[PDB]
Design a protein around this motif. Structure first.
Motif, short mmCIF file in Angstrom:
data_model
loop_
_atom_site.label_atom_id
_atom_site.label_comp_id
_atom_site.label_asym_id
_atom_site.label_seq_id
_atom_site.Cartn_x
_atom_site.Cartn_y
_atom_site.Cartn_z
N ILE B 48 0.83 -1.20 0.00
CA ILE B 48 0.00 0.00 0.00
C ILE B 48 0.87 1.25 0.00
O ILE B 48 0.59 2.22 -0.72
N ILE B 49 1.93 1.25 0.80
CA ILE B 49 2.85 2.39 0.83
C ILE B 49 3.53 2.57 -0.52
O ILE B 49 3.67 3.69 -1.02
N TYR B 50 3.94 1.46 -1.14
CA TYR B 50 4.59 1.53 -2.45
C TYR B 50 3.65 2.08 -3.51
O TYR B 50 4.05 2.89 -4.35
N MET B 51 2.38 1.66 -3.48
CA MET B 51 1.43 2.12 -4.48
C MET B 51 1.07 3.58 -4.27
O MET B 51 1.06 4.37 -5.23
N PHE B 52 0.77 3.97 -3.03
CA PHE B 52 0.35 5.35 -2.78
C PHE B 52 1.52 6.32 -2.86
O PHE B 52 1.37 7.43 -3.39
N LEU B 53 2.68 5.93 -2.34
CA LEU B 53 3.86 6.78 -2.28
C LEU B 53 5.00 6.04 -2.98
O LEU B 53 5.69 5.21 -2.37
N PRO B 54 5.21 6.30 -4.28
CA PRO B 54 6.16 5.49 -5.05
C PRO B 54 7.61 5.94 -5.01
O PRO B 54 8.47 5.19 -5.52
N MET B 110 7.13 17.92 -6.18
CA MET B 110 6.02 17.22 -5.54
C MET B 110 5.59 16.01 -6.36
O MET B 110 5.28 14.95 -5.80
N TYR B 111 5.57 16.14 -7.69
CA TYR B 111 5.25 15.00 -8.54
C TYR B 111 6.35 13.95 -8.48
O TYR B 111 6.07 12.75 -8.56
N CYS B 112 7.61 14.38 -8.35
CA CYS B 112 8.69 13.41 -8.17
C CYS B 112 8.48 12.61 -6.90
O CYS B 112 8.71 11.39 -6.88
N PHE B 113 8.03 13.27 -5.84
CA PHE B 113 7.75 12.55 -4.60
C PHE B 113 6.53 11.63 -4.73
O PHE B 113 6.51 10.55 -4.14
N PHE B 114 5.51 12.04 -5.49
CA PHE B 114 4.25 11.31 -5.49
C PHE B 114 3.85 10.69 -6.82
O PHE B 114 3.09 9.71 -6.82
N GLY B 115 4.32 11.21 -7.95
CA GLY B 115 3.88 10.70 -9.23
C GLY B 115 4.49 9.35 -9.58
O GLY B 115 5.52 8.95 -9.04
N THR B 116 3.84 8.66 -10.51
CA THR B 116 4.24 7.32 -10.92
C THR B 116 5.07 7.31 -12.20
O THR B 116 6.09 6.61 -12.27
N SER B 117 4.65 8.06 -13.21
CA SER B 117 5.36 8.07 -14.48
C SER B 117 6.77 8.63 -14.31
O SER B 117 6.96 9.66 -13.64
N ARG B 118 7.75 7.96 -14.90
CA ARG B 118 9.15 8.30 -14.72
C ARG B 118 9.79 8.91 -15.97
O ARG B 118 11.01 9.01 -16.03
#
Lengths: 675, 675
Positions: B48-54, B110-118
């Protein structure tokens, strides 16, 4: 008996294709279609005349022996109900009721000459009248500058009504001649039932204020039903008691009469037209007791006795009534084709949407010159015509003749007629559609998808205007197919011994899974919206996840640490030393994904299938395709899926063919390893 | 080899079902799902942590050996392009460019902390800036009442911009937490390509007026592109020559530099950031030659050097910016998920729509406190990051660090910077998406359905606002499946001898039709929208029309004139005396309609099938169903199709099974007639 015994070799795609030869592909060209349907044979011209003008078709088919009495009874009942209901729609449309009388005679005859449906009743309809009244109010407000009469205001209202009616007729005719009307293939039976029910509730909520004998502002557009109900509820304090009382008495009398007619259906030779006795007693009581000023109740008023000459409407006003006329035409065509399809399915014949649209458009266009507002199919009149035993459209002709006989002679008898009686008779003859709610439990315990399409259509059609309500009901109706695709069967299946049948492992207790074989089946056309879902379902239900297998292999490795293309499936390179400590499984050598139930492949589907085959080959798992349709094979070779020529042998004509091919390849591999 | 040899009896539905036993139907209940996913194992909480906060997921996966140089180059290029493009979007959004500087630093981190696309680049986007500017203009007009400065006007504009940005962020977060984001399974690759192309054309037409150095009214909403183009074209007379000239020179210089970089891709170790040399030479020329008042060209103006403290935006203005914030949030999420999916498919990994929506919403919400307007994915920056070799999201972090280094120290260097240079650099770095038009010939000669979905998406997304353009593009995209269903294969098929295969008669020249047998196949789920089409296709292509047969029998009759249910198929009662003068045909005793390719049956489909069976039985033609899926059998027994128990024997497991059953029944009938 002829036992099912066949002796054929394996029929994978290459070995099957090498035994087949491509066609000559006989010439199907555009010119061949172009020269056809222009020879103008007498049969072709006769068929065109029959399709475009159907009155000449079924008149020779009319039989005097078994149709005359039913047609006469149906016409009498239709005219009896058409008189006060038409008057009610007229006085609702902010026009004098005599214009409703005109709009109850000419359009019916014109539709009889041109319309296709032989059981629907044509005339004024409620929501059409609400739209006409809203347009007339928006153009000509309640207070306009021209004792203190309103004849000029009513004249302006009928002019704008005729203008928008003619515009609706022309655009309906234009839509019909442009072959628009194929959308009648939509409008599913739950959808049309919900649409008619929502229309009925709209009529009820519209005429509730007229039953109460209160005059408020009219609401047309989105959220019309809730606004009208709020307007009625906020003005219950300002109420008259005598009009409401007489409305309730005639309501009870009509309910009792209808229940008596239904209870004694076997006894009377024909259902008596109680709607005529109702209106005649109502107007007799109104004339005798003189409620028009003793209690100041609403009265339909004086009724002119005329057959006014044709007049040209106001064309210049077309620029402001674009969207209104578009909505009126769309709603009228939709209601007419809905009731026509419902009655055709009830009886057994069929109706043509294009012909209905053309007939309605030309009927409205010609009748607009006759001082008639926009028409549609009257749902309550159509059901009562169906119930009383209508068989032809001459019942509408008899109804029009009765309306004419009222207009020329009897018209001055209805001057003292309370509008509450008209409202109540509309409600009692409309109560017959509230029994259409009986399909809700017929759809809950049976095909809940029809239940949700019915609820969606009814909700989007009641709480929102019909012109956008029906289009959004159709939108969710067609996306329902998408949803049904997005939830496939997703069944892993085995076989029972000594047979060709392949059935779900969770079906019947003797379809034993072949060891090392996993068969995955999808009841969906595996396009973009479900390709990832299909991949996830295969990786989950079959218990073979290539990513998980690679992760387990890597973790076992770290535990033990202390043009020519490469082959699609690589053999396992991990030695027995590392293989000693492994999470050993069934180790299925192949998985086969039968494509018998799919219809097509999308580009995203091709990419997903290719990456799936690549991943399973990287793990070391052969993937075969069973029973791909020729369209599916065409969609595969269409894309770059067959760039590698060593993928044509993963295609099999049947699930059993794929299983036998896997068995043969396993036996050959074992023989090569041994010998 | 294992030859395909099977010896099994006939497997029609009754004889197959009598050999099978129903399951125990193991308990799949709501409570079993309910108690699961709440045990709170360490693995589950970690997932859950990995999915929400990647950000904590792939940082340990980062490798210094092969990622550092590529990440550094990508970050340098991203910051170099992010500076002037961000300034351009800021000055387009009717706000000072320093707010664009703020909106280019905080959201990326903020997106680097939370977003998924790299691989996508986060920052300001054009149509978002147009929406923000339109909202700010609508609230605070060009002329407002507060020498003759505009600082108060700009303050009100940035206040309303922050308000609508925060509202968009909150509603995006609310949509994300409510599991909305499954719609990412839509947005097909042609659809997203067309959407990005239309967005690119929107940016080009928006910044064409800024390249020309002319100030006009801004247009936002439907038909924005055509209105903006008309506004530009009508004001070409009022033009300045020096700004346009310098824009054309920098346009040519950037085009030549990009062509040189592409031509020498093998030679240089990394593509040089020519966008920095461009802007530095542009601002140097602007400062030296002093065009700001010599030619009165547009200049970006003074740039404050600050890092202003967090502030609470204006909540009370939310009541008027409902639809605007809804559109902004929808467009931003759609663009971000579109570019994320495009880059993921380009590389191979996958992105989560829900996580992207949550990250974008919380990012916008927190950044709105930092005086930043609404963000989205910058398409041109994302492609240049992909091309230069981006591998992680730390390139965006380096871009933000470069932006900060500009803000604190170098910010006063860009005071003399013409806006035409910013417009031209945006166009030259956006020209990389006009090569995405290359899929039009890639779709014309290959799967024209993708061609028409691409054209529909591009047209509805360019000539109409993105907020409704994408939803209507999705609507026609999903109705494309309906259309593809409504045009099935509609193939009559025979068999080639001594095999189980059944192939189209117009396929391969040896699939001989069985005499007296007609087999009709449909590649569609035969629901309401194509049931009548299927019936007509069967009646036409097979040459067996029951109505025509009855008409021919009646005309031959008139020529010769001078609970227990009845059996479904009635034998021919016409004697040999009347049968002497008949239009004799093949007289097929059965027609079989295989249901292997269908997915489900609708209620209208059930009614059509029942009336078809009834009509063919009335003519005297047996109808069998071959290979019905268990879902199809469930849908048949669901309705009243199986009320007559003598219809269960019309169901067969395969086409060959139905053919053999027909042969056995014919042999039995002949034996009974003889013996």
């Amino acid at each position: 008996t002829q036992k099912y015994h066949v002796e054929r070799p394996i029929f994978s795609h290459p070995v099957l294709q090498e035994r087949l030869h491509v066609k000559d592909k006989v010439s199907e060209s555009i010119g061949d279609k172009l020269k056809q349907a222009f020879t103008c044979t007498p049969k072709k011209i006769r068929n065109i005349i029959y399709m475009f003008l159907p009155i000449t078709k079924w008149l020779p088919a009319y039989k005097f022996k078994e149709y005359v009495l039913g047609d006469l009874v149906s016409g009498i009942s239709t005219g009896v109900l058409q008189l006060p209901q038409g008057l009610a729609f007229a006085m609702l449309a902010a026009v004098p009721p005599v214009f409703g009388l005109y709009s109850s005679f000419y359009p019916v005859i014109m539709y009889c000459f041109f319309g296709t449906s032989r059981h629907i009743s044509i005339g004024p309809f409620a929501v059409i009248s609400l739209m006409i009244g809203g347009v007339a109010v928006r153009l000509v407000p309640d207070d306009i500058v021209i004792t203190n009469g309103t004849e000029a205001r009513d004249a302006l209202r009928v002019k704008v009504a005729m203008s928008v009616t003619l515009l609706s007729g022309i655009i309906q005719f234009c839509l019909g001649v442009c072959r628009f009307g194929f959308v009648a293939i939509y409008l599913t039976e739950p959808l049309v039932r919900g649409f008619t029910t929502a229309a009925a509730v709209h009529v009820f909520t519209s005429m509730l204020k007229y039953l109460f004998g209160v005059k408020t502002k009219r609401y047309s557009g989105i959220f019309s039903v809730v606004y009208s109900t709020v307007a009625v509820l906020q003005n219950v304090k300002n109420l008259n008691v005598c009009s409401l009382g007489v409305g309730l008495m005639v309501f009870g009398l009509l309910l009792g009469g209808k229940e008596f007619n239904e209870r004694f259906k076997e006894k009377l030779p024909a259902p008596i037209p109680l709607e005529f006795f109702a209106v005649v007693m109502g107007t007799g009581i109104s004339a005798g007791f003189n409620l028009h000023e003793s209690y100041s109740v609403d009265v339909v008023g004086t009724l002119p006795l005329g057959l006014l000459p044709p007049a040209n409407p106001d064309t210049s006003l077309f620029h402001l009534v674009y969207v209104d006329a578009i909505a009126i035409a769309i709603v009228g065509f939709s209601v007419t084709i809905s009731m026509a399809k419902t009655l055709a399915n009830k009886h057994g014949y069929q109706v043509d949407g294009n012909q209905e649209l053309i007939a309605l458009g030309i009927c409205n266009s010609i009748g607009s010159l006759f001082q008639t507002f926009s028409i549609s199919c009257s749902l309550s009149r159509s059901l009562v015509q169906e119930g009383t035993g209508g068989k032809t459209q001459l019942a509408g002709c008899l109804a029009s003749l009765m309306i004419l006989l009222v207009i020329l002679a009897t018209g001055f008898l209805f001057e003292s007629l309370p509008q509450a009686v008209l409202s109540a008779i509309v409600i009692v003859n409309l109560k017959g559609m509230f029994m259409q709610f009986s399909d809700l439990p017929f759809f809950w315990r049976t095909s809940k998808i029809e239940l949700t399409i019915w609820l969606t259509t009814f909700v989007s059609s009641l709480f929102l205007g019909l012109d956008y309500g029906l289009i959004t009901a159709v939108i969710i109706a067609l996306l329902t197919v998408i949803y049904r695709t997005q939830s496939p069967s997703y069944k892993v299946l085995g076989q029972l011994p000594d047979t060709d049948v392949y059935i779900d492992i969770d079906a019947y207790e003797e379809v034993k899974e072949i060891p090392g074989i996993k068969i995955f089946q999808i009841n969906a056309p595996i396009y973009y919206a479900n390709s990832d879902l299909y991949s996830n379902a295969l990786k989950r239900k079959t218990g073979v996840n290539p990513a998980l297998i690679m992760g387990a292999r890597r973790k076992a490795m770290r535990k033990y640490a202390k043009v020519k293309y490469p082959p699609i499936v690589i053999k396992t390179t991990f030695p027995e030393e590392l293989q000693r400590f492994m999470p050993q499984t069934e180790n299925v050598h192949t998985i086969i994904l039968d494509f018998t139930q799919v219809n097509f492949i999308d580009s995203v589907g091709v990419k997903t299938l290719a990456v799936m085959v690549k991943e399973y080959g990287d793990v070391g798992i052969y993937v075969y395709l069973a029973g791909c349709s020729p369209q599916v094979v065409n969609d595969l070779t269409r894309n770059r899926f067959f760039e590698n020529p060593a993928l044509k042998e993963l295609l099999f004509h049947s699930i059993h063919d794929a299983v036998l091919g896997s068995h043969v390849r396993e036996a050959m591999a074992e023989q090569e390893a041994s010998a």
